[PDB]
Design a protein around this nucleic acid. Sequence first.
DNA 1: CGCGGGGGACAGCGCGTACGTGCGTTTAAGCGGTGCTAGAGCTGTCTACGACCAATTGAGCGGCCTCGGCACCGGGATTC
DNA 2: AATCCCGGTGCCGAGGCCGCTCAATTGGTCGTAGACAGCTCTAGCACCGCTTAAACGCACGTACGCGCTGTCCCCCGCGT
Lengths: 105, 103, 82, 82, 98, 97, 95, 96
Amino acid sequence: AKTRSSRAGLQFPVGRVHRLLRKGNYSERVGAGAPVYLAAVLEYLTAEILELAGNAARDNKKTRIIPRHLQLAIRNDEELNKLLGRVTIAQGGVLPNIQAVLLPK
Amino acid sequence: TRSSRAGLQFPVGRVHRLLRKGNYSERVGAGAPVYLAAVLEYLTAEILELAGNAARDNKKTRIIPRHLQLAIRNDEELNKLLGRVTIAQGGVLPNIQAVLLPK
Amino acid sequence: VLRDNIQGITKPAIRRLARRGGVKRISGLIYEETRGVLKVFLENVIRDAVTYTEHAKRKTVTAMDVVYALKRQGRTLYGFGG
Amino acid sequence: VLRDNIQGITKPAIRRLARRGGVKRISGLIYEETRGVLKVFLENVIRDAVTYTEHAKRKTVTAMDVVYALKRQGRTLYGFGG
Amino acid sequence: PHRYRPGTVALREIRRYQKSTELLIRKLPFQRLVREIAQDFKTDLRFQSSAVMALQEACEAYLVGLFEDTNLCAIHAKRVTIMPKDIQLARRIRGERA
Amino acid sequence: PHRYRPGTVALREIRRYQKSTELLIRKLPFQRLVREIAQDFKTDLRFQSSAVMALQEACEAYLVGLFEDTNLCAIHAKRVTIMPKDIQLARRIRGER
Amino acid sequence: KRSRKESYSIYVYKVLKQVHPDTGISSKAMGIMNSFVNDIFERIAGEASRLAHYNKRSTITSREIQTAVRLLLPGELAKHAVSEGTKAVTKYTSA
Amino acid sequence: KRSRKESYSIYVYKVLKQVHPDTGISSKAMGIMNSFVNDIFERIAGEASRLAHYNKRSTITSREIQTAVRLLLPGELAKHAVSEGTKAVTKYTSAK
DNA sequence: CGCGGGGGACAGCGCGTACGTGCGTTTAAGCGGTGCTAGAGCTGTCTACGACCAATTGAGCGGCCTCGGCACCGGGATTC
DNA sequence: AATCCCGGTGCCGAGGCCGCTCAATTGGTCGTAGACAGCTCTAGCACCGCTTAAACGCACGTACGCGCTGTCCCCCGCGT
C-alpha cells in the first residue's frame, strides 16, 4: 500500500485533495486526515448520484448516463434536489409535472 | 500614516493587515488597501448622509437603527446592496396596499 | 417539561405582524399556518446555529452563532455583531 | 448596424419555453413581456462576463467568463467548465 | 355607543405598526418556543439573551416580509383577505416550498 | 376534417418538451441578440461559440423556471392563462423586481 | 499539443464501474459531474475556512471538514458522508 | 482585567462628522454600520480573491479591487466608488 | 401568416357568511430588586503537529486507436 | 389520429491501452498554534411580588369571500 487512497480504502485521490486544500488558501495548515475525510465524502456523494443516475438510464433503456439521467436522479431525490437547489444541470430538462387545474374535466 | 497620505479617515494599515490575515491571496498590492479603504469610507459615507437626513426629518439629532433602515430602504441602490440584509430595530417602510383603503 | 409553546405566538401577535406587512383582512386559517411556517424558519436557523455552537465546544449559543446561521441561509442581519 | 434583434426571440420560441415550463394557455401580451425579462437577464449576466473579460485583458468573452458571471448571480451552470 | 366601519381600525393599526420598529411578539413566549425547538436538536443548552433577540429580530422581519408577499397574492386573486393559499403560493415562489 | 379541442395540443406539447433537453430558441437569432447587447457595452467583441451556448443554456433555464413560478401565480388566481401580472409577481417575490 | 486540463473524470469512471459496471457516461454528463465535484468541494472547503476563522484557528483539520459537511449536507446525506469520512481518516491514521 | 475587540466605530464617527457635524449615533446603529462595513469588506475581498484565481494571479492589486467594485456595486454607486478608489490611490502614490 | 371558431377572460350580480369591531372579563407580561453560581474569558506553561526544504517515486494526464452503445429510422404495435 | 415499441442498421464517441512526467510520497528538521490545566470574574438563571397592559372570549352585523351567470374575444387548432 503505497498510495494514500489504498491506505484509506478509497477510490478518490487523497493526494490530489491534499494538494488542492493547500493550494487553495483555506488555512495556514491542513491536517493529514482532512484530505482523507473529504475524498471519502466526495466518493460517497459520487456513488449516491451515479447509483440513481444509472437506475434512470436503465429505466430509459440506456446503458450510458446522459445529463438528463443526472437531472432525473437529483430532482427526484429530495436530499439531492436540496443539495443542488441553486444548481443548473446543462441539458437536463425538467420533471414532467402538469398542474391539476390545467387537466380537462 | 498611510491614511493621511491617501487623504482618508479610514485606516489603510488596518485594511492591509486584514487583507493578508484573511487568506484572500498570497500577496496584497500596495494600492489594494488604499483603494479598498476609500470605497469603504465612501459607502459608510453614503449611508451616514441619508441616515442623518432621516434623523433630521424625524426631529432627532442622533442616528438610531431606524434612521439607517429608512435611509437604505428608501434609496434604490442601497436597498439593492443590502437586499438580503436585516437591519436590527429597523422596522419597515410605511406602505399600505391601495385596495385596502376605504373608498 | 415544555409543550405546545408555538401557541404562545398568539393571534394578536400574528395580527400585528400582518398589519406591519400591510394586510387589511386575515383569514381564520392564517394563524395556524403562520405557526408552522415560523417553526420551520426557526428550525432551519436554530439547527445551523447549534451546529456552530457545537463546533466551538460551547454550551451557550452566542448571537454570533445566530448571525452566522442567518448569513448561511441568505438572511443577513445587521446590528448584532456582523 | 444591428437593431431590433430582440424580435429574433419569436412568438413560437417563447411558446416552446412556456410548454416545457408546463404552461397551457398564453396571453398575447406575454411575448413582449418575456423579451423584456430575457433582455434584463442577458444584460445583468453579460455585464459581469465582460467585466471579467476586461480584467483578463482579453478581447474575446470566454465561456469561463460567463460561468463565473452566472455563479455571481446565484445561477450556477454545470457542463461548461469551472 | 360608537362603532367604526370594519377596516378602519385595521388601517389605523397598519399605519401605526409601519411607523414603529419595536418587536411585536411577546418576548417570553418566543423565548420558551426557541428553547423547546433547540432541545429537539441538543439537550441541556443555554442561550445568550442577545442570541434570542437576534432570532426574534430575524423571525419577525421574515414574517413581516412574508405577509407583504402574501398580501400581494390575495390582491392578485381580486381579494382583500389573506388566506393560507396566499402564503403557500408565496413560499412556493420563494423556493422554500416545493 | 379533424380538429382537436383547444388545450389538447397544448398538453401534448407540455409532455413533449418536458421529455427533451434541446434548446428551444433558434441559435442564430439568439446569437445576434447576444452580440447586440454586448456591443452596447463594449465595441469589437468576439465570442467563443461555447460562450454563446453557455449564455443560451442559462437563459432558457432561467425562463423555464420563471415560467414555472409564473404558472403557479396564474393558478393561485384560479386562472389557467399566464399573464404579465403573473411574471411580475414571481420576479417581485424572487427579489428580482 | 494542447494544454493539460485536469478533471475528475477518471475517478468518476471508477466509482461508476463499482456501482454500475456495465453503465457509461457521455461528455456533457461527465462535465456536469465534474462541475458537481468542484461545486461541493468549494462549498465544504469554504465553510471549513470560515469555521477556522471564526475560532481563530490557522488550521483546517478533518474536524473542520466534518462540521462543514454537517452544516452543508441535508440529514441522511450528511450522516452517511460523516461515517464514510471518519472511516477513511481512521484507516489513514493507522496505516 | 480587560479584553480588546476592534471595530470601525471611531472612523464612522469621523465620517459622520463630515456630512452631519450636528448629529450623533446610537450604539445599536453603531453596531449596524460595523456589520455593514465588515459585510461589504468581505464581499469585495471575496470577489477580488476569485478574480485573481480566475486569471491565475497571486496578487490582489487595486485593479482587482476596482473590478470587484464594478461587479458588486450597482451602477451609480460603482461609478462613485471607482472615483474614490482611483483618487485616493493617486493621492497616496503622490505622497510616497 | 392567415382563418375560423371555441372556451376562457372578465365583468355584473347576488347570496351567504366570516371576520372586524367593541366591551367586559381574564390572564400574564413587564418591571426592578435580590440572590446564586455556572460558565465564559482571561491567563500561563509544554509540546505536539504542521510548515518548510530536499530527493525519490509512481499516480495521473494527453494522445492514441478500436469498438460498441446508441442515435437513426421505417415498419407494426398500441392507446387515447 | 397521433403516439409508441420493435427490429434493422450504422457511425462516431466511449473506454481502453501506450507511455511519459510531474505531482505525490518519502524522510526529515524547526517552531509554533493550541491543547490543557489553573483562575476570576461576568451574566445567565432563578425566584418573587407589585402593577397593569395585553390577552382572551363573546356578541353583533357588516361587508367581503365565492358561486353563479352571461357575454364577447382572445388564443388554440390547422392548412398553406
